[model samples]
Structures are given as C-alpha cells and as structure tokens.
Target: MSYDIQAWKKQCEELLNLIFQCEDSEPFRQPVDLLEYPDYRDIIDTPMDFATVRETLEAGNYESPMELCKDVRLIFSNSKAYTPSKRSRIYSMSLRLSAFFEEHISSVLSDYKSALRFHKRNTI
Candidate 1:
C-alpha cells in the first residue's frame, strides 16, 4: 500500500491549526469548575472564556490539549480545591486526560501535587 504522506501531513496540519485556534479563544481562558475551586471561580465566572478547554477536554486531540492542559491545570490546581481531600479529583482528571495523550497519569499527578504544595505555601 502506497503512503499518501502529503495528504496525511496536510490533515495533521489542519488539525493542529484547529487546536491552536481553539487554545486562543475564550473557553481556553475561561474553563469550567466542577469542583467549585474559588481561584478557578474568579477566573471563569466572568466571560465564559473556558469553552476551549472544555471542548478540548471533551473531544480535541490529545497532544495539543495536553500541552494546553499543563497551563490550564497550573491555573486550576492553584484553586481552593487543592487540599488533600480534593486532590483525588485532580489526579483522576489527569488520569482521564492521560488516556487521550498516551501520557503518564502518575507524572500528571505529581505535577498536581507540586502545584498543590505551591498553593498551600503561598495562600494566606
């Protein structure tokens, strides 16, 4: 079977562009708060800017969303939800997302832990 390398490249480029554009939009900035994290509430309550992140989590390709999520989770993990009781949700979400990206859930969990520690130390 002959490989249609050009066609495949074009398709991949198109998908990447779509994800990039999605990252640039409102939802990416806005995000949803399933756990009612106060820090997240402040960021997402105003303009409904989180649609991009929501869409990406729900259906977008993994690699791009995974990168975007690192940023998203940085902001989110700082939310009031970072305490030990809520940590499982963060870990679970990361695990679910890892399925899409072929990523390490444990690594993402570690990042969440690091962020949680930062927030705990910084929050007065």
Candidate 2:
C-alpha cells in the first residue's frame, strides 16, 4: 500500500551504490560466465547478476520495490546454490552480501512506511 516508484528507485540507487563498494563484491559485479564456469546451469536454474539487476532497474521493469529486492536476493541464492559449500570463500561472501542487503532493506522499508504515514496524515 505504501508503494512509490520514485522513493523505491532512490532507495535502490543508494543500496546498490553501497553494495558495489564492498570488497567482496567483484564476483557478483557481472554475470556468471557459463563458458568459463561451465555447468553453472546444472544447479542454478535461473541466473542473476548485479549488472542485469541494474539494467532492469533503469529500464523501470519492476512494478514494485519488492520485485527489485527479489531479483537482488536471487543473485545470492544462485551463488549459494551453485557453490553449495559453507566453508568456501564465495559462499561466505554471498552470505555477507545477503546480510548487508537485509539490513539495509529493513531500513529502506521503514523509511517507506514513515513516508506513507506522513502522506496519510496530511491527506486525511
């Protein structure tokens, strides 16, 4: 009910900027190359990448903020699924990125909720 594309886009931009700044973010910066890391499709039925996500966002393909959030999470999920090893470096980094996204997304959602409350208070 508290949906606003402009606000969502702004939040996405901020979160993405922060994500890109992470030291362990290099692997996820682009799509997983099937030719180099072949057999990637064996586990990850659907692949996702930060570059694709960014383009989708800029294209305004998402009808809701949660849609973008889902795609972002898919990147981590795919990574975890492909690696499937808890002790590995890539797996650990994926976990870290997941945590970071969740933390920031919670803040983003709170901001959206407050904005909705303010709008409702003034309108009614």
Candidate 3:
C-alpha cells in the first residue's frame, strides 16, 4: 500500500476542524466535581485551537498520529463522564469524533508501516 504523509496530515486537520466545530449551541453545563477528574479538567477549562494541534503534529513532536488520537479520546471520554444529561449532545458528538479519529489514525499508520516494509524489502 502507498502512503502520503501530507495527505494524512490534511485529513487530520479536517477531522480536528470537525471536532472543534461540533460544539453545542447552548453553553456548557459546568460539572460540580470537575476538579475531581484532573485527568481532563484542563480540556474543559481551556479549549484547544485546531491550529495549535496542527502545528504540533507538523512539528513531529509525537511518535505517531495514534498518540494524538489517544489524547483526543481521553479528553472526550472525560467530557462525557462529567457532562450533564442536558448537555449530552456535546458528549455524544465528541465521542463519535474521537472514535472516527482513532480509526483514521490507525489506517494511516498501518498504511505507512506497510509502505515502509515494502521499501525495506525492495532495497534489500
């Protein structure tokens, strides 16, 4: 299989945009015990910008896209666990987005590794 890093990065950007735009029209219902869940407490208080995330990915700070996906999943899971029933839409959208991101990242990484293996075999 062939893999294009640039294309994968573009798709990542699009997915991040969708995730960021999935916010509910209504204001978020602040969880009373938000401090208890320190794992993702910062996500709720400090909203992330897609551009910053994109920059981080481009900088190659992390080993793979899967790492970024995991962080996103953690944030969404934390949000869902703490969100009120009335604001479940935000949680639902975020969870779905996180799942999609995971799948996409997996496929991209698999394709990339396959191409690498193929290249190594051909060079030998």
Best by TM-score: 2
lDDT-wise, the better of 2 and 3 is 2
Segments of candidate 2 deviating more than 4 angstroms: 1-5, 113-124
lDDT per prediction?
0.42, 0.81, 0.56
- In lDDT terms, which candidate is top? 2
Superposed by TM-score, candidate 1 places the C-alpha of residue 7 at a distance from the truth, in angstroms, of: 9.6
- Candidate 3: residue 118 lDDT (0-100): 66
When sorted by lDDT, best at the front, the candidate numbers are 2, 3, 1
Question: Would you estimate the TM-scores of all the predictions?
Answer: 0.26, 0.83, 0.56
What's each prediction's clash count? 8, 0, 0
Model 1 alpha-carbon miss at residue 31, Å: 2.0
**What lDDT is reached at residue 81 by model 2?**
83
Cα lDDT tens digits, model 3, 2-42, are 54444456666676666556553122223334466565555
In TM-score terms, candidate 1 sits at: 0.26
